[model samples]
Target chain A: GDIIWDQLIVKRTLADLLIPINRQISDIQSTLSEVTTRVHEIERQLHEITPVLKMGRTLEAISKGMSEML
Target chain B: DIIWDQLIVKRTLADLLIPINRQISDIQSTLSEVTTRVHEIERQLHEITPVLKMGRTLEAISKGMSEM
Candidate 1:
């Protein structure tokens, strides 16, 4: 009986399929982690980026400056 | 080959295939979940882009004011 050959073939076939699949999963996981961290930081610092009220205040100050120059 | 040997081979193949099939199913589910996450992230990015552009415009205006 070629029982040994059968087992070897099964192992080889399974390895061929599983190895790349796991690698793909690993790559996705890494990318997902990286992006998640980036999104977290962006959301955190987003508070400092823009406040609509602050924009209006800056514009008002600029208007005052322009009036003085004029 | 004897019938018993053939049966053994078939049994071994099934044993390996069943678990492998389950793994593939798990991978597919994970892929689906990852896709949703990716979509959500993309949506967040789209929502944030306008604010980012507005910030840039404001920054330029403030710089222009200083130049004078």
Candidate 2:
């Protein structure tokens, strides 16, 4: 009994620890999901603004170059 | 003499409670920082994969549209 332990007791102990650990992991995962949503929202905003900024710069460059050329 | 003893006892009690309160607050702050960092890393991983996939899709769509 001392040298070779019972399988059932070992399994029970592991399951007890695993349950709480899994719960903590799930809580962390939900927090991560929130962060992911916020990050994606920021990404979407940036993606939309980038083209407008690019177009503004292109317009400024064209106006400047056309004035110089004229 | 009794008043002095009560004053000392109050001071001692305050000293005892202060550290416990400080330790609990410290633990809470540390846990918040840890949770924030964990979420930040996870967010970075999330941002990477879908953005990469979207880029691939945009490229494919642009290529197809350009051909048209």
Candidate 3:
């Protein structure tokens, strides 16, 4: 019986707070998802390009030496 | 009663989208440039690929293909 008032206060506070809290959290979730996907896409592209970059630099060096033979 | 009304939700969502759009657009721009460079570098490498093997450096060049 003594805890009823405490419970009531907590319930009322939660009732009013839930709407804004849920809305903000949902908003954060959706935007965060998009951010993660874009970031990952960028990461993949960066990784995918690495091999090509390395090969290109190496070939340039080797080709210069071959040309020197002429 | 906001009741998921248009006023607050609309403003809040727009605020979030504005920043998202700005950052994504800048990233997209830079990525395009990087993609261009990747292509350019690949093409340059291709032109020399055939002649490269005959240069007598295969033993050393073998180690240059990239970590990927």
Candidate 4:
């Protein structure tokens, strides 16, 4: 009567959910890394050009121009 | 005595969810990052339009200056 096993149902069912869930999360991780990489590439695109574009509207316009150049 | 072990095992399986839930939260934040990046891109595209509008105003100014 001391050992209660209502919550812990370690069986094939646990295996079923656990394996699929892990794979799905793993897949999400891969996608996030991909998007993260893309953002880096986008950042790289602006790296050198942004240094001179620090003033105001003309700089903003130029920044837009620079982006279109890419 | 037997009930005690079952309860202990029960808690153990429940505890397993801790790490799993944390991973799920981590995935959500990553997705948010992707969302932010895409939005940043869209904003950049939006910023371009006003520049074109300014070009038309600039041409009009050039015409005004030429007349002056």
The prediction achieving the highest lDDT against the true structure is: 4
**What TM-score does candidate 3 reach?**
0.44
How do all the candidates rank in terms of lDDT, highest first? 4, 1, 2, 3
DockQ of candidate 3 relative to the true structure: 0.04
What overall lDDT, based on C-alpha atoms, would model 3 receive against the true structure? 0.62
- Model 2 spans with C-alpha error above 4 angstroms: A1-5, B1-68
Please write out the lDDT profile of model 1 over residues B1-68, one tens digit for every residue. Answer: 68866676577667766765776676577667667766766776677687669989999999999999
Q: What share of the true interface contacts does each candidate keep?
A: 0.08, 0.00, 0.00, 0.31
Model 4 C-alpha lDDT versus the unseen true structure? 0.71
For model 1, the docking class works out as incorrect
Largest TM-score belongs to which candidate? Answer: 4
Q: What lDDT score belongs to each candidate, Candidate 1 first? A: 0.70, 0.63, 0.62, 0.71
Query: How would you class the docking of model 3?
Result: incorrect
Q: Candidate 1, after superposition: displacement of residue A52 in Å? A: 11
lDDT of 3 by residue, B16-35 (tens): 45655665666567567656
- Of the pair 1 and 4, which is ahead by DockQ? 4
After superposing candidate 4 on the true structure, give the runs of residues whose Cα lies further than 4 Å from its correct spot. A1-13, A47-70, B1-10, B49-68
Per-residue alpha-carbon lDDT of model 2 for A1-70, expressed as tens digits? 6413543354455556556655665576576567667666866765685576568668978999999998
- Full ranking by DockQ: 4, 1, 3, 2
- In order, what DockQ does each candidate have? 0.13, 0.02, 0.04, 0.24
Arrange candidates, best TM-score first: 4, 1, 2, 3
